[PDB]
Amino acid sequence: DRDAAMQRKLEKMADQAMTQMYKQARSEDKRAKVTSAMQTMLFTMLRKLDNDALNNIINNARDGCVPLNIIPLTTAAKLMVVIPDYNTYKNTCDGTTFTY
Amino acid sequence: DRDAAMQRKLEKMADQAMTQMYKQARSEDKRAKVTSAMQTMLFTMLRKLDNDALNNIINNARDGCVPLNIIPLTTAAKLMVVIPDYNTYKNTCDGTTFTYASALWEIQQVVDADSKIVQLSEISMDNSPNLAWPLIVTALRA
Amino acid sequence: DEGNCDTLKEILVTYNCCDDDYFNKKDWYDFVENPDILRVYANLGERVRQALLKTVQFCDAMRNAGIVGVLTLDNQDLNGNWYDFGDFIQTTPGSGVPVVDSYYSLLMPILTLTRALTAESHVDTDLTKPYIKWDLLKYDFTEERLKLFDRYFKYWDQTYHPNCVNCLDDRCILHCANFNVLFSTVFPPTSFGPLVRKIFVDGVPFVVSTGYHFRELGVVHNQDVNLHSSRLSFKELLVYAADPAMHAASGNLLLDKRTTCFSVAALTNNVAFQTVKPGNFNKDFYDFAVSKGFFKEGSSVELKHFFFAQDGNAAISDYDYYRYNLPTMCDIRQLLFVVEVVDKYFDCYDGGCINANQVIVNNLDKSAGFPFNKWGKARLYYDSMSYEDQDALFAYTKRNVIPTITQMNLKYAISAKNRARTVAGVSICSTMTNRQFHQKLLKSIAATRGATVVIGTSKFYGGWHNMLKTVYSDVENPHLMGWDYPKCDRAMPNMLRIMASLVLARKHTTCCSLSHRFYRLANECAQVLSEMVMCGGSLYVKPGGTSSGDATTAYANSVFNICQAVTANVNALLSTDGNKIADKYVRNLQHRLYECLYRNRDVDTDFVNEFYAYLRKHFSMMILSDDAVVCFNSTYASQGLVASIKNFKSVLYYQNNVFMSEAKCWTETDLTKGPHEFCSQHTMLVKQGDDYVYLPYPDPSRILGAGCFVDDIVKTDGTLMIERFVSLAIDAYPLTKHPNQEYADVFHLYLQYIRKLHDELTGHMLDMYSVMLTNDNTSRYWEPEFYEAMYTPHT
Amino acid sequence: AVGACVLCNSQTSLRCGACIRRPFLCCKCCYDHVISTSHKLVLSVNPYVCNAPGCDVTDVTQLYLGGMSYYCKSHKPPISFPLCANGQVFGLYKNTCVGSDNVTDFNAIATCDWTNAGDYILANTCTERLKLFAAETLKATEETFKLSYGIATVREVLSDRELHLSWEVGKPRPPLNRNYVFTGYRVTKNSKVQIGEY
Amino acid sequence: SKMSDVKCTSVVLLSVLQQLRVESSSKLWAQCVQLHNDILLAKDTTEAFEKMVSLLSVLLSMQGAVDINKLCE
């Protein structure tokens, strides 16, 4: 009985370390690499949102045409978006209407 | 059994005493350090105040008692106006000199909310939107 | 009563205070929308301040002509004249007496809605001429207070000492304070606050506080000012660091146009803006929830408790929300009776002053105010000073005053309204003393089951059911009601905060002497009530109103709450006609109430007892610091003999100075289903073990939000979550007996999530090593028995 | 209160309050100083005096650490071990105390009186810490020697430069010398003020 | 669950924004926190997507900050 008690004590002593080292490792890992986790999760959710406007602005933002200020909402306000090439230009531009 | 139990007690007793001594030393160290910090801050604060005008107005007071607010209100050498809009600007501290609390001040630097500088020309009725309000404008007694 | 107020309109229009179309703007009476209304009221000033002087002329005209009578209000036409002599007796000349107990005592709350003593701020007491210019220094207006009194309230037979220091007891302190809170609008506002004086230590000059000029209690001087000291003990260092005079004198002036409150100095050379970030997102859990059949388009459970964010200048706006606090002058006989009854409520508890080695600080590692928070948490100061100096400090602030600075921080926690809530962390040099002074009474209130003030009584283990069955203390035709005070923290007038502090300091009848009690009260006023807030690197001045970071906060709120309830009750009993009350007992009760209120001057303990028993038999309550539940008899309340939501609206209209719209006062008329909402936990009636019990159940959206959105990034993994979820499930168990199905499912969601969490945990652990020994007990958190044990009455 | 031993420089919390200057001593070093001399009082971060009321024994050699305080051999609780053992008196860092055996000249300093030439010749020919400690000690002895003297009452004040000042009764008069700068006093009755230095 | 996926995305979006030190441009932080607090309380859907477009454009306005290709892969 005494030896069994001793062994049981050693067991319950080991389990503390066995279950604390894991918290430590996992927590430092999560806290360290976060600035990338946030962005990856963001773009995953943004693909899964499945909207059209967002998809158009995202593709455009991929291949160059990025806007220089908050897109407005009202029917009278300013917007300044660059265009990097003629190809993308005639892709978007038409007459006097610039679709975006 | 007798002696084994005695030694077993002795271990815990000595260890309690030792950790207690460590705690005492820690407390005394922190205490002395904090007292030094407090004294230093007090003296470096004191050695700043404009002793001349203060001596003047207090010795003028009929008892040595003067309500606190008038102490800065009449011995401060600075003035940190804070402005939330071009309008209240126009109506409090226009131009390069202004008057408030019955004395004459003059601008010396107009730092906006981003801790940048703003030349006194930029602040114009049509140049309101580009300036990240409020507008912390300092001054100097004169 | 805004539904039918058809003489207030007619007066305001008749006397050109506001043209007619004003009242066609919806929502005008409110004091928190269009606070312009005060400008409308204040245009009755020079029609009330004329009636006062016509009264003072009439009183003399009586005295020197040999008549005796009473002066009732309803004999004075608004112009000013007097026209009623029905019951005046005549005696030998030069010896008449006018009785004006019940005339200046119904006008007192009007004398500061309509701001009638402000034509005394202009020169020559004329309106048209320009302002007066008091010298900036003059720090003591005793003579002027005396003259104003003796010129307006001439025959008010009691006494009035300007400096409340020389007052006899808790029935004179209230009296003189409530007079001062009116007489202190005519004086400039840059002449209150601490009083300083240049003292000398070790041959170097200082500037340190030695007094105060309160706007209510008057002038107060220290009693231990030591010129020419040489050493600096630790107690002394503390007292001089916490003081604000050094800081406000070594900083530089500042004029703030963002607010309208005052502004004293600005310690640094730059102002600091503060922001509040959003909160992280627990994707894994949210994707689980959506997979279990939740958050669908058009359900009855949806997110409404998110982590709102704030831009730079929120802090100063939220401080500026003090503009609601006004100087209000409460009535002064109905108050000196209501304070009696409210004390009867606090009969059974005990308390007193204690030593230093008995206070029990609950938690020790929390900030210690300004500027002490630059060198350590509270643990450092609580371990540095020994019990000896830690008690000398106390017995020294029993005989002087100590101003302090209290910070202001934005809070970071879930909510449902996009306003940011602030909290004030008072400086330690105040909490130490307040703790030693109140701890006994407070720890005696929080450990007594079965009384009105229910603090410290858990809802678990059959506590909510016992609360609810105590409230129904055998009233006759129950109808549980409720209410809520808007902006309770920023409108409570100074007078009621002072009454609260007095009733909580009414226990040391033998521990401490009278001057001791007065300096303790003055200390509490200058530390908590009207202090020097430090909101974003720049001091300010609080006009009034409580703060929510001191020691005696929830209990002071409970006292003020009981005071509003009893005041509304008294008003509703008086205002009833009187000749139509059919019974022969309650009518006599009213007829003795009025006389004991106005036609008397000393206590009446027998009648106070009868009234308080009448209340406890027709108005049983339950109070947790402002969340009330009443169980009033109903036949009465309809005949007009106890409170009603209309009466609470009225009382808040003339004593708090806000407007409690009836869209938030739930009134339940069926006794079974319990109170609609108390302490943010609806109540249901659920069969359990052959008898029926009440259970508290939260609002599901709140539980879902608290699971889905966490404030820190490390709380997003199911490392500690295996424990952070047991608590949420414990709080959300009672939903499992609700009849609505989604309320039935927000339990099993948590319950399946815990199991899945633990299974993935053993997976990862048995991967990192290859063994696991005794983490078996966790097989008891994912069964609905462990929680079902938590709402039973055995333990 | 933790300091460096004047001989071992190891961190320690021991002081000989029987020494006028109370220097920090490592465990073994204070042991050697306390076994050999009349220095029979030792003070730690708390004094080592029998906590028993009426027990005014002082030396640690007759003291046993008991429950949470230390007692004489009389009032000792059952489990209580002596504070002196293995050349160590009980204090902080007993396992890191290195110490030394230079106790000799240190003891010479602790016991000398500064009234003979050889004392000074030693005091100026010793180790550095030993030197500075000898300095502080001899200076304190001469300070209390000055303070062991007393008063002088003015019989007459002839002029601003000529004086008739009689000296204290039954006292060895401090000689007519420049170094001893005299602070004066004129009592009103009622707040004797310091009239300055002469 | 289409409505209630236009609030969580905004929470994530504003967090990512703040993580790029947009707190400095005290006008930009004002407009961003406005759009976020406004999205959260929006009973409609199209309006939510409007504010979402604007906020995302705030994120895109800077070029070198967040590598767009290596993410959109």
Ligand SMILES: Nc1ncnc2c1ncn2[C@@H]1O[C@H](COP(=O)(O)OP(=O)(O)O)[C@@H](O)[C@H]1O
């Ligand atoms: N039932 C009654 N009929 C006629 N006169 C009365 C009656 N009751 C009282 N009065 C007299 O009228 C006075 C009150 O009259 P009130 O209605 O107040 O008019 P006023 O305000 O002009 O006095 C009382 O003092 C009494 O003298």
Ligand SMILES: [Mg+2]
């Ligand atoms: Mg009448």
Ligand SMILES: [Zn+2]
């Ligand atoms: Zn009084």
Ligand SMILES: [Zn+2]
């Ligand atoms: Zn007491």
Ligand SMILES: [Zn+2]
């Ligand atoms: Zn040593």
Ligand SMILES: [Zn+2]
């Ligand atoms: Zn020694």
Ligand SMILES: [Zn+2]
């Ligand atoms: Zn002893």
